[PDB]
């Protein structure tokens with residue numbers, strides 16, 4: 038629980054707590070919150086975010102694939118967990134003994150699983166319906182009835198839920214959203230019995246139309262304090278608190294003379310006498326090469342990145358001479374300046390979701406709770 | 420280990436072995452090969468690559484920072500390890516105890532280290548000289564002599580080597596290169612005595628001028644079978660064998676009707692009756708969103724990724740009806756077709772170095788040695 042390089046990410050768990058608690062109050066009392074923590078909680082720390090979400094009101098968790106669910110179980114999480122993606126029928130028994138719910142969307146998957154499992158633990162399934170996303174899910178009434186039939190036949194197979202996912206809930210215009218919502222209601226009629234859990238809402242849908250969430254919402258991106266899209270920021274019911282920040286420190290500082298070049302390709306040349314700082318973070322840490330024309334914060338001021346970004350380090354133009362060890366902020370606030378994940382996303386020309394997920398296993402995560410350090414997670418630590 | 424998702428990377432250790440052994444045969448008997456395995460061996464697997472490189476002829480290893488060095492030690496590697504980047508003066512004792520060599524380039528660093536460490540383990544330092552990279556290293560005579568003086572005075576500090584790094588060794592034009600080389604020889608004259616290890620060459624430099632590498636080369640990108648740059652591919656002394664491949668399997672297949680949308684934002688619309696496959700790999704796996712429109716391999720044919728790439732999945736247009744479980748190759752060979760890391764780098768508008776480093780911890784690595792499966796490493 039220690040690290041030996043001056044580069045780290047900070048995760049504010051009080052922000053995550055507040056983001057989830059505010060949702061708990063916004064939603065009808067009889068609507069459960071499933072916190073989605075796949076991809077190591079969007080790069081924030083799976084078990085740490087999960088524990089906090091459960092404290093704030095969430096009652097279930099969601100991950101992308103089986104390995105992620107098993108990892109949470111090994112770390113002591115006992116809350117129900119749903120695997121949103123595909124799994125192998127041969128792993129049905131493992132999921133059952135570990136009390137992990139599985140997503141199902143095709144009958145031939147059940148055919149195979151039935152021939153491999155015979156109890157005694159029940160397997161809870163969530164039927165995925167494709168209402169316009171085109172990713173995973175059933176689309177035909179025949180296939181839907183067949184899946185339900187195979188589940189009812191098996192004494193250890195249980196249909197615990199049914200859901201769909203929206204492709205454009207974060208768009209101001211709600212035409213396609215309305216289409217998917219209506220399709221969902223229509224497909225719901227294909228079921229002979231309504232399962233106990235009906236869900237469809239992600240962050241954008243739950244925050245914009247809390248009354249149209251049925252009995253469970255799958256809360257992701259907004260839990261981390263990130264807007265589903267900048268376009269709906271002014272439509273959010275409550276203010277979101279950004280939980281992720283990234284920092285480093287100067288490990289070298291030198292003054293260059295006019296003509297001297299910097300980094301690979303010698304693409305940058307100091308025109309006048311200027312101070313250059315080197316920080317221990319590079320593209321192998323998720324600070325991609327495409328960010329070469331971006332900037333960082335040092336001493337409350339913007340400092341542009343100079344030359345090409347390296348695998349483990351990069352250089353920046355300092356306003357003047359600063360001492361080694363001076364804190365640098367890549368994502369976060371310093372004085373009156375701020376660099377948000379959305380800013381980084383803009384220059385990488387991607388969405389905020391992708392940024393924290395790309396900050397590699399190499400960067401330690403320091404967790405804060407009650408304005409104090411709770412723990413440090415170093416993926417390659419002793 | 421084992422994994423429960425049909426997406427995995429394969430690392431051919433035989434390719435790594437060959438790439439290193441071929442260099443061993445081009446170098447002089449007294450020149451050491453220091454295998455560069457920082458960033459988890461450029462995303463290939465730190466201990467697996469290190470072990471293989473050592474068997475092939477390398478005698479030392481290099482990493483980016485202390486934690487990476489400590490990880491190798493904890494995994495059984497006992498060969499010498501040099502930390503190429505910065506470290507804290509307070510960690511000198513830890514480095515000494517684990518027999519890890521440290522890079523040094525500031526006198527104030529040594530002053531602090533001296534005050535905090537008094538033995539009993541010796542600490543081997545490698546002096547970094549900035550000859551034009553502008554990253555790390557000393558630049559003037561005064562600083563250099565002060566550093567040497569501080570090392571000589573301490574009973575447990577030892578100057579094991581000194582080095583520099585080239586910024587344009589991969590470029591056809593060798594003007595800036597020759598400039599850095601000449602500066603290095605000049606700066607070497609500031610030392611009262613030549614340390615036991617003098618090094619300066621990386622993959623490009625070692626492969627193009629094997630006779631001007633001094634006594635140790637730092638072999639990186641080429642060890643993995645990737646050319647330092649497209650410009651020097653024809654200048655390489657021997658053919659490099661690419662070691663990394665990435666695969667997945669179709670988990671869903673469906674036929675869409677004209678007018679139907681695919682993925683977030685519904686940016687894709689089927690113009691005719693099409694077969695769409697879903698594979699369990701997405702941007703949280705390092706298969707970045709920018710790879711939309713790129714082509715993957717399925718049933719020996721190229722198929723485009725359609726619609727936006729999601730966090731854990733993406734969709735491809737199939738050449739027709741294929742069964743669930745069909746193998747999809749994102750990087751590698753399938754029949755007569757091949758997709759190289761260079762091709763992925765081209766689409767992403769970056770360099771090959773960045774690609775395997777970005778394939779995340781979430782993707783298991785399967786290792787092959789002697790044409791047999793040797794081990795499975797699943798970070799989670």
Ligand SMILES: Cc1ncc(COP(=O)(O)O)c(CNc2conc2O)c1O
Pocket residue numbers: 073121202238239240241255256257258259265390728729730731732
């Ligand atoms: C099935 C499912 N439900 C809920 C969520 C949470 O979405 P949210 O972070 O907007 O609240 C996701 C993540 N959605 C994804 C975002 O990018 N790729 C994904 O698969 C998901 O895949």
Ligand SMILES: Cc1ncc(COP(=O)(O)O)c(CNc2conc2O)c1O
Pocket residue numbers: 346347348349350455503584620621622623637638639640641647772
């Ligand atoms: C000091 C040092 N020596 C040797 C190497 C190996 O270089 P090579 O993979 O071209 O043989 C690197 C990696 N240099 C980096 C490559 O990309 N960013 C870097 O910082 C390095 O930093």
